Ligand SMILES: NCCc1c[nH]c2ccccc12
């Protein structure tokens with residue numbers, strides 16, 4: 518997260534870290550046994566890390582649980598990043614508490630101008646590289662479809678939205694991928710793609726979770 522703030526430990530209880538020997542992606546806990554992330558985050562050998570703040574230190578609130586299965590969306594296209602969503606099932610159910618908690622799925626899609634919280638352990642520089650150990654947060658508005666389409670001609674599908682600032686300086690970034698965009702207590706987005714981080718006129722692009730609720734529910738119900 519570029520231009521954000523330190524969230525504070527365990528203040529974003531649904532935020533998970535996906536670890537394959539190192540943190541590679543974020544995710545959102547949506548029930549005791551399932552995580553939602555980006556399809557571009559797919560790999561084998563994932564351990565889900567819940568209750569994290571400093572990802573490099575064991576601070577006492579973590580649960581580390583291996584993934585038993587991953588389900589990439591059937592229509593994901595890695596080239597266009599259309600349908601950039603994936604479910605991860607835990608080998609065992611997390612123990613839910615104040616510091617490890619699920620986030621509700623949307624009942625309706627959020628509008629342009631809604632204020633959201635974006636979070637992650639990704640790069641904090643738009644040109645350099647610096648990775649934070651503690652969770653970073655950004656408050657950002659959803660942008661109009663028209664402005665998003667204008668920013669990225671020919672690339673924005675019905676399954677994506679922009680959030681952020683056209684002026685630059687505040688954005689999600691590398692390593693934030695798969696992480697949450699929560700608006701009014703609902704998961705509305707997943708960190709998906711952008712052109713660089715925090716560049717003028719290149720806001721971040723997010724998977725539109727509201728479009729996937731039926732798939733997520735049905736998938737969970739049968740897996
Ligand atoms: N807005 C951040 C989108 C993003 C995800 N992974 C990345 C890697 C490099 C640059 C941007 C990104």
Ligand SMILES: [Ca+2]
Pocket residue numbers: 569570571572573574575576579
């Ligand atoms: Ca830790």
